[PDB]
Amino acid sequence: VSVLTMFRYAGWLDRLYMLVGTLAAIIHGVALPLMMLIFGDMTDSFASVGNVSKNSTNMSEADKRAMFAKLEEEMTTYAYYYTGIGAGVLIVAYIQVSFWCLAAGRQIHKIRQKFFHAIMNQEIGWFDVHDVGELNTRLTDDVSKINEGIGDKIGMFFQAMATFFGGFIIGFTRGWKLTLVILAISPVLGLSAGIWAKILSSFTDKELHAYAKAGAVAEEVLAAIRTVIAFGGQKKELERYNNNLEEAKRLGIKKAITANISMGAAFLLIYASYALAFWYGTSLVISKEYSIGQVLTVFFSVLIGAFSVGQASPNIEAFANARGAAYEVFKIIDNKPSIDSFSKSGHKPDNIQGNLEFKNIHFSYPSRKEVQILKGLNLKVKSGQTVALVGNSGCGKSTTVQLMQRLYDPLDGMVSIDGQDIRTINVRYLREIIGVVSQEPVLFATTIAENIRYGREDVTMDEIEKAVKEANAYDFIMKLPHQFDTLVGERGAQLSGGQKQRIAIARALVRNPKILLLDEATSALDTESEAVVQAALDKAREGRTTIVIAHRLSTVRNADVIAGFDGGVIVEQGNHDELMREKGIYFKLVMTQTLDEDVPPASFWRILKLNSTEWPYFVVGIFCAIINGGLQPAFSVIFSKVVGVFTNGGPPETQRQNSNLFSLLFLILGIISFITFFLQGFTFGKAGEILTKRLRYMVFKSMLRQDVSWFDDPKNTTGALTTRLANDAAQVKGATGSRLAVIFQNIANLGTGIIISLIYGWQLTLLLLAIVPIIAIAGVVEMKMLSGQALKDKKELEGSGKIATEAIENFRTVVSLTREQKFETMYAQSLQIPYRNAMKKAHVFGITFSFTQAMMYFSYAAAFRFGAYLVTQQLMTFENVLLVFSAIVFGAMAVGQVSSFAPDYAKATVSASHIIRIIEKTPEIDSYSTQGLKPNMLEGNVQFSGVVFNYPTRPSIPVLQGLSLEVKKGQTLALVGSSGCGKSTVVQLLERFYDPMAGSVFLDGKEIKQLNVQWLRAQLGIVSQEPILFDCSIAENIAYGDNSRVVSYEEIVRAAKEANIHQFIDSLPDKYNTRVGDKGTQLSGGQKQRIAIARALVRQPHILLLDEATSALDTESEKVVQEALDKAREGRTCIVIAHRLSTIQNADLIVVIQNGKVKEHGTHQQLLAQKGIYFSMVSVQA
Ligand SMILES: [Hg+2]
Ligand SMILES: [Hg+2]
Ligand SMILES: [Hg+2]
Ligand SMILES: [Hg+2]
Ligand SMILES: [Hg+2]
Ligand SMILES: [Hg+2]
């Protein structure tokens, strides 16, 4: 079912090219061993010449002619063969790559449109359940994975098995024993991979749990940053994060060490197998004469067949993970379970004037177990009326409105519009006959003309005009620039909410429904605009049967009929007077209410500087890189010598020669290889480990010691910072790894390859390095062109995805239903551009890889043609021919190196650039000295003079302009302003979060500028709006060590005693030792505030600061907390900016701050006796 068959579905003509491409992938994979079968045949003919050169030379003139004639024949075979295979792999590569794009393109585009349709066709279900909107984005990433699954990855898979099965085929066919030997040594290679699976996979996960502790500490500190800053508890958070880092690093070292050990054993088994393969390959020639040394290399090509399984595994994982992600959700992704709504058919009533009927309706939202919110209902409103509903116990009114649009089919009973059931009539038509003005208006990002046009697609500006005129929306739009062509700026949030709703009214007005549903449309709006929108609603009524729910009973007064519920069942119904008459529910309520990142700057060799500072010395790492570096070419020399004594050499000692080279190849390569992998792993493992620690430490610490809009007003976030701390330090660990990688391959290829090249017949080196770097560049340009396509594709789907996410995230598109098909139609038109683009990139993806494989034969071409033949005949021996393989494999060796181990620099360098720019910091105000703390400074009189300030946004209309205040010690400084900030900013400047732009601020009369940054924050009573405690024992929270300040039990006792939180301290288990229970989820606001107050008065500040402390709070809690504050303050300087003017009535100096400039100031009775702003504030506060 869904696992295999369904995944590939449809694609009638697609499947044909799918199979053609598959076939070309097969013959492509087949091509590689055939090129290597040729290699054994070419070796034999090439071999026979050397035998006469060493031994006989009986006749001379004959050999210079005939042997080379034979060589020329081999030149002819060389030429038609490498070429035949080359043209083959060129064509078939272009085809097999054409497979992804051509098949997957149509498959995925079909998936895309069907997915978008099923998504819009599930209706209610999507908003009720699943991941609540955030899911289908991820899902379009899933269809992107689908795109990755059915692509050429499969073609590569068949190619791989073709090289595998075909490799072993040729192996068995031209001899059967060595294949068998290699297969016997083969499972050993699979066992070594077992070290990988147990240790490596586990230790990644092991280390993560360790740093998880470090992440939690870093998570909260950076979120609680202004609090820890204000209290200066930084160095302690420093300490915790350092301990957790200390554990995470030791799990890091075990990971690196073991990893390198594993890869090391892998190479052991590789050189071991390679050698044993030579021992049995050699045993078949000298004392036997089966192989002439032809097949011996081809049987190694059977090892290329062994590499083909390793090349196969990722493609399967690419198919499976794409398959698995798609098919499990594909049944849910696609089709249409639906059938409570759908889109189509049904019954069309044309009578269009009717009576709504609710009959015995029992319903529960499909949250299931929730008790029926509506259990039974009977309500019937005659045509032309306006019915108003009210309730107490909750939901159940909104439910009836929800049911009326058939958003939910009732469990029992029926809703009948006119005489017909609602379930008979067409859903689309039903939605079209029912207009709805919701409590929360919504405007799509488009013109107001289009937002209306979403009400009805086919419409003209005359109807738009009459619409807004009828919605009285024709005023603000005219004054608004661009008129009807006026965009809704910054997505859909631009203008007044009353205007938004009013526009929504015009939109529903174009709909011209005979039923109008108003759910709290007036709610959450200012009273004036409330009355305006209300007027629009009133002009929209009486021509339409309607139902209105709101919490302002003034609008409920003029309703023809009002309905009470209390538990979901209808109880009272009738005219207003009748309801007040009943002294019921209505009368009861009436009387009751009376991660964008990455700046340009780059490291430039500065990485190794921080490394060397934290990497004290390691010459053993680089030395290990040298001996492994020189280890690879030893192989190329040895291998040359193996076949070397077979071609050029005499009959005696050949057996011994093979034994010696076998053993030399085994221990000299394999053992030393184990040594170097375990040694470097032992070096760079601890190197990168401690680098990751010291880096993460000095980062989190460089971060905590700087604030200044990195925290106060950042474009950053807590998560981005934690991410910085983890990932980046891991990357600089790779940055350090690349150094050793570079010196290693430096001596490994260039140095030894060149030195060895000096002993050549010359001439070969130049031609060889005229190839390898070029094909290397071809490998670079392949990845680059690849990323260019990835980016352009992602940008196109980006735009289509943006407008798609716009559709799916807004569920109200269903209330008009006009936009159901309209949105996916436009989106279809959006998806159209990349589709046509796909065939073009089909050729792009297609021709490139073909050309890449076109370099396969050309490498072998220039190699053996010019290598053998013409270079041969003078100064050419058993070496320098196989040394071709040396310098060639050396280039490939580097490839192996670059495409493995540490990250491809890049991200490492960049992450390093950030982690470095962060550790450099911008210390500004940090700790240092800056003052002496005269004992006599305990006064507390805060001066402000000519102070201007702006948060770091220049044209933000700065909150401080020309501001000056004063407060004497031991007295209350009241503060009042319009709302929000400029209130708080004074407090922040006193906290010295930022030193003001101009003017000055004083505490004892000294300038804050000249005051100690720390000691200024040493006496402050700062208590914020929403108090946040360090996660710790509440006793330990109460006492925050400033510097040397010890945890004092009797002191924190005095703290609780003063804060009146001692109530909870007395009771509850452990008393003071009760922890807050995961960020104080067990405590209410009054308690948290009491504790925060205790945090303040432990410090014994001469200055207390309250920023709208009781603003968010309620009932008695405000009084007991205010009482605590009052017993804490008035003995010392305090500033209360709270918006509560009833408790501000007792103050020494009340200050009204307008626009940066203090307007009025004086005691309550003084300003109140006066008249102006303050008097307005109290009069409207009442
Ligand atoms: Hg593709
Ligand atoms: Hg509910
Ligand atoms: Hg090494
Ligand atoms: Hg602000
Ligand atoms: Hg804590
Ligand atoms: Hg106060």
Short mmCIF file of C-alpha atoms in Angstrom, two decimals, residues 608-829:
data_model
loop_
_atom_site.label_atom_id
_atom_site.label_comp_id
_atom_site.label_asym_id
_atom_site.label_seq_id
_atom_site.Cartn_x
_atom_site.Cartn_y
_atom_site.Cartn_z
CA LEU A 608 44.78 29.27 15.08
CA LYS A 609 45.73 32.22 17.32
CA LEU A 610 42.90 31.51 19.76
CA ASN A 611 43.63 27.87 19.24
CA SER A 612 47.30 28.20 20.18
CA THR A 613 46.34 30.30 23.18
CA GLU A 614 44.00 27.51 24.29
CA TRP A 615 45.96 24.78 22.44
CA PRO A 616 49.20 25.27 24.31
CA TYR A 617 51.42 23.06 22.15
CA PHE A 618 50.78 20.07 19.94
CA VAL A 619 53.53 19.24 17.48
CA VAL A 620 52.48 15.62 17.75
CA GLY A 621 49.24 16.31 15.90
CA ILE A 622 51.00 17.86 12.92
CA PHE A 623 53.74 15.21 13.14
CA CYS A 624 51.05 12.57 13.07
CA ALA A 625 49.72 14.34 10.03
CA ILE A 626 53.17 14.11 8.51
CA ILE A 627 53.64 10.38 9.04
CA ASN A 628 50.12 9.59 7.75
CA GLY A 629 50.73 12.01 4.93
CA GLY A 630 53.88 10.21 3.92
CA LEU A 631 52.04 6.98 4.69
CA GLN A 632 49.68 7.19 1.72
CA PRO A 633 52.40 7.43 -1.00
CA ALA A 634 54.29 4.47 0.50
CA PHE A 635 51.29 2.47 -0.67
CA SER A 636 51.60 3.86 -4.19
CA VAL A 637 55.30 2.96 -4.25
CA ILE A 638 54.80 -0.50 -2.75
CA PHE A 639 51.91 -1.35 -5.11
CA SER A 640 54.06 -0.21 -8.02
CA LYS A 641 56.80 -2.56 -6.81
CA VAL A 642 54.41 -5.52 -6.36
CA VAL A 643 53.32 -5.70 -10.01
CA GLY A 644 56.75 -4.25 -10.75
CA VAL A 645 58.72 -7.40 -9.98
CA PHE A 646 56.16 -9.34 -12.01
CA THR A 647 56.66 -7.27 -15.15
CA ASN A 648 60.32 -6.29 -14.79
CA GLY A 649 62.33 -8.86 -12.85
CA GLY A 650 63.94 -12.29 -12.98
CA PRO A 651 62.57 -15.68 -11.99
CA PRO A 652 64.45 -16.13 -8.71
CA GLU A 653 63.28 -14.56 -5.43
CA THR A 654 60.02 -13.36 -7.03
CA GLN A 655 58.14 -15.46 -4.46
CA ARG A 656 60.15 -13.77 -1.72
CA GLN A 657 59.65 -10.37 -3.36
CA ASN A 658 55.88 -10.86 -3.25
CA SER A 659 56.05 -12.02 0.37
CA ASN A 660 58.13 -9.01 1.42
CA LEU A 661 55.90 -6.56 -0.41
CA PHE A 662 52.78 -8.23 0.96
CA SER A 663 54.01 -7.95 4.55
CA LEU A 664 55.44 -4.48 3.98
CA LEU A 665 52.10 -3.43 2.57
CA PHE A 666 50.36 -4.92 5.53
CA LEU A 667 52.29 -3.76 8.58
CA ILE A 668 54.04 -0.62 7.20
CA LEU A 669 50.78 0.80 5.94
CA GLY A 670 48.02 -0.68 8.10
CA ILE A 671 49.78 -0.65 11.49
CA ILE A 672 51.19 2.86 11.12
CA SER A 673 47.74 3.95 9.88
CA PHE A 674 46.21 2.62 13.13
CA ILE A 675 48.92 4.49 14.96
CA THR A 676 48.30 7.82 13.28
CA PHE A 677 44.51 7.67 13.55
CA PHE A 678 44.67 6.84 17.26
CA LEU A 679 47.44 9.41 17.83
CA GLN A 680 45.87 12.36 16.02
CA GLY A 681 42.52 11.42 17.49
CA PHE A 682 44.25 11.58 20.87
CA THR A 683 45.70 15.01 20.06
CA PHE A 684 43.01 16.97 18.26
CA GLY A 685 40.38 15.21 20.37
CA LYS A 686 41.53 16.89 23.58
CA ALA A 687 42.49 19.98 21.60
CA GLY A 688 39.03 20.53 20.17
CA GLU A 689 37.53 19.46 23.48
CA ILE A 690 39.18 22.07 25.65
CA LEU A 691 38.82 24.56 22.83
CA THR A 692 35.07 23.96 22.93
CA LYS A 693 35.09 24.57 26.67
CA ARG A 694 37.28 27.65 26.95
CA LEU A 695 35.46 29.08 23.93
CA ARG A 696 31.94 28.48 25.30
CA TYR A 697 33.05 29.80 28.68
CA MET A 698 34.66 33.01 27.45
CA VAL A 699 31.69 33.50 25.16
CA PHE A 700 28.91 33.17 27.71
CA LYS A 701 31.06 35.34 29.98
CA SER A 702 31.77 37.96 27.31
CA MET A 703 28.01 37.97 26.75
CA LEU A 704 27.01 38.34 30.38
CA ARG A 705 29.47 41.20 30.92
CA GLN A 706 27.90 43.29 28.13
CA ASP A 707 24.28 44.42 27.90
CA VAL A 708 23.58 47.71 26.09
CA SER A 709 20.80 46.67 23.61
CA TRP A 710 22.31 43.22 23.13
CA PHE A 711 19.74 42.50 25.79
CA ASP A 712 17.71 45.67 26.44
CA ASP A 713 16.74 46.20 22.80
CA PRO A 714 18.28 43.40 20.69
CA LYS A 715 17.47 42.19 17.22
CA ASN A 716 18.76 38.92 18.67
CA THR A 717 17.06 36.37 20.94
CA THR A 718 17.89 34.04 23.86
CA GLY A 719 17.70 30.98 21.61
CA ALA A 720 20.08 32.48 19.06
CA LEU A 721 22.54 33.02 21.90
CA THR A 722 22.32 29.47 23.24
CA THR A 723 22.64 28.27 19.63
CA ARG A 724 25.74 30.45 19.35
CA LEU A 725 27.22 28.88 22.45
CA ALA A 726 26.70 25.30 21.31
CA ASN A 727 27.05 25.06 17.59
CA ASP A 728 29.64 27.78 17.04
CA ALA A 729 32.16 26.40 19.53
CA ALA A 730 31.72 23.00 17.88
CA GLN A 731 32.52 24.70 14.58
CA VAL A 732 35.69 26.44 15.84
CA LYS A 733 36.64 22.94 16.99
CA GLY A 734 36.45 21.98 13.32
CA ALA A 735 38.31 25.18 12.42
CA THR A 736 41.18 23.87 14.51
CA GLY A 737 40.84 20.46 12.83
CA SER A 738 41.37 21.90 9.35
CA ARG A 739 44.89 23.13 10.16
CA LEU A 740 46.20 19.63 10.79
CA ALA A 741 44.17 18.46 7.82
CA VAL A 742 45.99 20.95 5.59
CA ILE A 743 49.55 20.22 6.69
CA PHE A 744 48.72 16.52 6.48
CA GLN A 745 47.57 16.57 2.88
CA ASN A 746 50.25 19.14 2.07
CA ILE A 747 53.12 16.77 2.73
CA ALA A 748 50.90 13.86 1.67
CA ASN A 749 50.34 14.94 -1.95
CA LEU A 750 52.35 17.91 -3.16
CA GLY A 751 55.59 17.13 -1.33
CA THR A 752 55.90 13.39 -1.75
CA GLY A 753 54.12 13.32 -5.07
CA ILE A 754 56.59 15.89 -6.45
CA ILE A 755 59.72 14.31 -4.89
CA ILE A 756 58.64 10.94 -6.27
CA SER A 757 57.87 12.73 -9.54
CA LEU A 758 61.53 13.72 -9.70
CA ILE A 759 62.49 10.06 -10.17
CA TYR A 760 60.05 9.72 -13.08
CA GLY A 761 60.79 9.84 -16.80
CA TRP A 762 59.51 13.39 -16.25
CA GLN A 763 56.86 14.33 -18.79
CA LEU A 764 54.21 12.29 -16.94
CA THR A 765 53.88 14.60 -13.97
CA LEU A 766 53.05 17.61 -16.12
CA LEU A 767 50.31 15.78 -18.05
CA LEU A 768 48.92 14.28 -14.85
CA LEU A 769 48.64 17.58 -12.97
CA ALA A 770 47.17 19.06 -16.12
CA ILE A 771 44.28 16.69 -15.37
CA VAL A 772 43.73 16.17 -11.62
CA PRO A 773 43.42 19.83 -10.59
CA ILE A 774 41.13 20.46 -13.58
CA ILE A 775 38.77 17.56 -12.71
CA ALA A 776 38.97 18.81 -9.12
CA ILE A 777 37.72 22.19 -10.30
CA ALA A 778 34.99 20.30 -12.16
CA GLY A 779 34.09 18.78 -8.80
CA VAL A 780 33.98 22.22 -7.19
CA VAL A 781 31.88 23.80 -9.95
CA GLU A 782 29.51 20.85 -9.68
CA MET A 783 28.79 21.61 -6.01
CA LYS A 784 28.60 25.34 -6.73
CA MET A 785 26.20 25.03 -9.67
CA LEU A 786 24.26 22.65 -7.43
CA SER A 787 23.90 25.24 -4.66
CA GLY A 788 23.00 27.89 -7.25
CA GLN A 789 20.06 25.75 -8.31
CA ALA A 790 19.13 24.95 -4.72
CA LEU A 791 19.00 28.66 -3.95
CA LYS A 792 17.03 29.73 -7.02
CA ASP A 793 14.52 26.92 -6.51
CA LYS A 794 14.16 27.75 -2.84
CA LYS A 795 13.52 31.41 -3.71
CA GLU A 796 10.75 30.58 -6.18
CA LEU A 797 9.05 28.10 -3.86
CA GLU A 798 9.77 30.72 -1.20
CA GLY A 799 7.38 33.18 -2.79
CA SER A 800 4.74 30.56 -3.56
CA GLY A 801 5.19 29.21 -0.05
CA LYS A 802 4.81 32.65 1.50
CA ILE A 803 1.46 33.30 -0.09
CA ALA A 804 0.46 29.68 0.61
CA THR A 805 1.32 29.99 4.29
CA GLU A 806 -0.69 33.19 4.16
CA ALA A 807 -3.68 31.15 3.07
CA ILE A 808 -3.36 28.14 5.40
CA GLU A 809 -2.55 30.22 8.50
CA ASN A 810 -5.84 32.14 8.14
CA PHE A 811 -8.82 29.84 8.75
CA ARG A 812 -11.33 32.65 8.21
CA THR A 813 -10.90 32.15 4.48
CA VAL A 814 -13.58 29.53 5.00
CA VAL A 815 -16.22 31.98 6.26
CA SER A 816 -16.46 33.64 2.84
CA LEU A 817 -15.47 30.36 1.16
CA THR A 818 -14.98 32.58 -1.89
CA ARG A 819 -11.26 32.30 -1.22
CA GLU A 820 -11.23 28.48 -0.98
CA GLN A 821 -10.63 27.90 -4.67
CA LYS A 822 -9.45 31.46 -5.25
CA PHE A 823 -6.37 31.04 -3.04
CA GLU A 824 -5.17 27.71 -4.47
CA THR A 825 -5.94 28.96 -7.95
CA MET A 826 -3.64 31.90 -7.48
CA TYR A 827 -1.15 29.58 -5.78
CA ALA A 828 -1.37 27.21 -8.73
CA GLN A 829 -0.44 30.20 -10.89
#
